[PDB]
Design an enzyme around this catalytic site. Structure first.
Site, PDB file in Angstrom:
ATOM      1  N   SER A  72       0.775  -1.253   0.000  1.00 60.00           N
ATOM      2  CA  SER A  72       0.000   0.000   0.000  1.00 60.00           C
ATOM      3  C   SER A  72       0.803   1.298   0.000  1.00 60.00           C
ATOM      4  O   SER A  72       0.214   2.381  -0.170  1.00 60.00           O
ATOM      5  CB  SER A  72      -1.061   0.033   1.112  1.00 60.00           C
ATOM      6  OG  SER A  72      -2.182  -0.755   0.741  1.00 60.00           O
TER       7      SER A  72
ATOM      8  N   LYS B 133       0.250   3.629  -2.852  1.00 58.97           N
ATOM      9  CA  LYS B 133      -0.887   4.559  -2.866  1.00 58.97           C
ATOM     10  C   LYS B 133      -0.448   6.013  -2.889  1.00 58.97           C
ATOM     11  O   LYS B 133      -1.145   6.847  -3.445  1.00 58.97           O
ATOM     12  CB  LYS B 133      -1.855   4.294  -1.708  1.00 58.97           C
ATOM     13  CG  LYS B 133      -2.645   2.988  -1.842  1.00 58.97           C
ATOM     14  CD  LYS B 133      -3.397   2.658  -0.558  1.00 58.97           C
ATOM     15  CE  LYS B 133      -4.411   1.555  -0.736  1.00 58.97           C
ATOM     16  NZ  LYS B 133      -3.754   0.266  -1.101  1.00 58.97           N
TER      17      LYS B 133
ATOM     18  N   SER C  75      -6.069   3.305   3.812  1.00 60.91           N
ATOM     19  CA  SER C  75      -5.508   2.195   3.043  1.00 60.91           C
ATOM     20  C   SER C  75      -6.602   1.411   2.289  1.00 60.91           C
ATOM     21  O   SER C  75      -6.484   0.196   2.104  1.00 60.91           O
ATOM     22  CB  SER C  75      -4.645   1.283   3.933  1.00 60.91           C
ATOM     23  OG  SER C  75      -3.468   0.902   3.232  1.00 60.91           O
TER      24      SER C  75
ATOM     25  N   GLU D  61      -4.990  -3.668  -7.074  1.00 61.66           N
ATOM     26  CA  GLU D  61      -5.336  -4.361  -5.834  1.00 61.66           C
ATOM     27  C   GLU D  61      -6.326  -5.484  -6.113  1.00 61.66           C
ATOM     28  O   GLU D  61      -7.249  -5.287  -6.898  1.00 61.66           O
ATOM     29  CB  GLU D  61      -5.977  -3.377  -4.856  1.00 61.66           C
ATOM     30  CG  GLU D  61      -5.035  -2.294  -4.365  1.00 61.66           C
ATOM     31  CD  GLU D  61      -4.058  -2.790  -3.323  1.00 61.66           C
ATOM     32  OE1 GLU D  61      -3.231  -1.978  -2.854  1.00 61.66           O
ATOM     33  OE2 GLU D  61      -4.117  -3.977  -2.950  1.00 61.66           O
TER      34      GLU D  61
ATOM     35  N   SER E  31       1.180  -3.496   3.817  1.00 62.31           N
ATOM     36  CA  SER E  31       1.504  -4.860   4.184  1.00 62.31           C
ATOM     37  C   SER E  31       0.997  -5.794   3.105  1.00 62.31           C
ATOM     38  O   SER E  31       0.164  -5.408   2.281  1.00 62.31           O
ATOM     39  CB  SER E  31       0.946  -5.225   5.560  1.00 62.31           C
ATOM     40  OG  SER E  31      -0.451  -5.371   5.515  1.00 62.31           O
TER      41      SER E  31
HETATM   42  O1  GZ2 Z   1      -4.109  -6.631   7.168  1.00 65.08           O
HETATM   43  C1  GZ2 Z   1      -4.462  -6.010   6.176  1.00 65.08           C
HETATM   44  C2  GZ2 Z   1      -3.696  -4.815   5.759  1.00 65.08           C
HETATM   45  C3  GZ2 Z   1      -4.022  -4.139   4.642  1.00 65.08           C
HETATM   46  N1  GZ2 Z   1      -3.413  -3.021   4.222  1.00 65.08           N
HETATM   47  C4  GZ2 Z   1      -2.436  -2.315   4.864  1.00 65.08           C
HETATM   48  N2  GZ2 Z   1      -1.508  -2.856   5.665  1.00 65.08           N
HETATM   49  N3  GZ2 Z   1      -0.740  -1.760   6.093  1.00 65.08           N
HETATM   50  N4  GZ2 Z   1      -1.257  -0.599   5.488  1.00 65.08           N
HETATM   51  N5  GZ2 Z   1      -2.345  -0.977   4.702  1.00 65.08           N
HETATM   52  C5  GZ2 Z   1      -5.158  -4.583   3.746  1.00 65.08           C
HETATM   53  C6  GZ2 Z   1      -5.567  -6.042   3.927  1.00 65.08           C
HETATM   54  C7  GZ2 Z   1      -5.672  -6.463   5.385  1.00 65.08           C
END
Ligand code: GZ2
Length: 262
Positions: free
Chosen positions: A44, A47, A104, A140, A211
């Site tokens: 992410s 972004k 996110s 995504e 992540s």
């Molecule tokens: O644990 C998750 C984290 C996500 N995104 C994220 N992690 N760190 N910033 N954004 C999206 C799917 C579920």
């Protein structure tokens, strides 16, 4: 090899994974790098590049951020805390930018990518601002597969730190747009356990976390320390097994090592 690099190496060794760090201290424009030229999956953190590319487009379309985008049930992906509320309606490009950066939201990111003509449109913006390293290849959620050795959807800590610096503190964007990007980053909701957990609390910052698979855990931050010029800090971390757990604490530790080394 510096003392700080040796501390980062010890952290990496104990962590079991692979750590990438890039600091730019704008006080003197010096840099601390740890695996600064190795590729990591952005997840992410990408972004920021997509939101910035839309901000760039808005420089020649004053009303672009108010443009509505349809959100359909079929558009929803794996993490949609904001977009799920607006299904069968619309969100503006500003709303999508804010949702992507501050929450996110993955559906929001896909709408930003579409507005740029696809992942390659985001890469093209990167090149336009002097980043020859960044590549966005997928949307995504598949951009988060984070497979070791796979160049898709990766960058290096050195390149990302330079780019974040140009976007937030330099002139890659118009002044209005730069301020908007910084405002969004400073309003992030997801960052208290990552880089910012390792910083003195009197400091202020904006950041974007990420992540993905392989326990990939990332954060990129612009930081305003008390009594000195801003810093830009990127911390990327990835692990050998596909289902590894997130390690935001490793990013906090990296940031703490950097902070104490100033
Ligand atoms: O644990 C998750 C984290 C996500 N995104 C994220 N992690 N760190 N910033 N954004 C999206 C799917 C579920």
């Amino acid at each position: 090899t510096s003392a700080v690099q040796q501390k980062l190496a010890a952290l990496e060794k104990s962590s079991g994974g692979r750590l990438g760090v890039a600091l730019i201290d704008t006080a003197d424009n010096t840099q601390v790098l740890y695996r600064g030229d190795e590729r990591f999956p952005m997840c992410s953190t990408s972004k920021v590049m997509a939101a910035a590319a839309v901000l760039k487009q808005s420089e020649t379309q004053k009303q672009l951020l108010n443009q509505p985008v349809e959100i359909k049930p079929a558009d929803l992906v794996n993490y949609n805390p904001i977009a799920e509320k607006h299904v069968n309606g619309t969100m503006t490009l500003a709303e999508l930018s804010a949702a992507a950066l501050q929450y996110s939201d993955n559906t929001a990111m896909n709408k930003l990518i579409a507005q740029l003509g696809g992942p390659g449109g985001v890469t093209a913006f990167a090149r336009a601002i002097g980043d020859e390293t960044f590549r966005l290849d997928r949307t995504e959620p598949t951009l988060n597969t984070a497979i070791p050795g796979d160049p898709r959807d990766t960058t290096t800590p050195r390149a990302m730190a330079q780019t974040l610096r140009q976007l937030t503190l330099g002139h890659a964007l118009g002044e209005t747009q730069r301020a908007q990007l910084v405002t969004w980053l400073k309003g992030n909701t997801t960052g208290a356990a990552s880089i910012r957990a390792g910083l003195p609390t009197s400091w202020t910052a904006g950041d974007k976390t990420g992540s993905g698979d392989y326990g990939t855990t990332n954060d990129i931050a612009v930081i305003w320390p008390q009594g000195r010029a801003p810093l830009v800090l990127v911390t990327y971390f990835t692990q050998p097994q596909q289902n590894a757990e997130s390690r935001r604490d490793v990013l906090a530790s990296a940031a703490r090592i950097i902070a104490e080394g100033l």
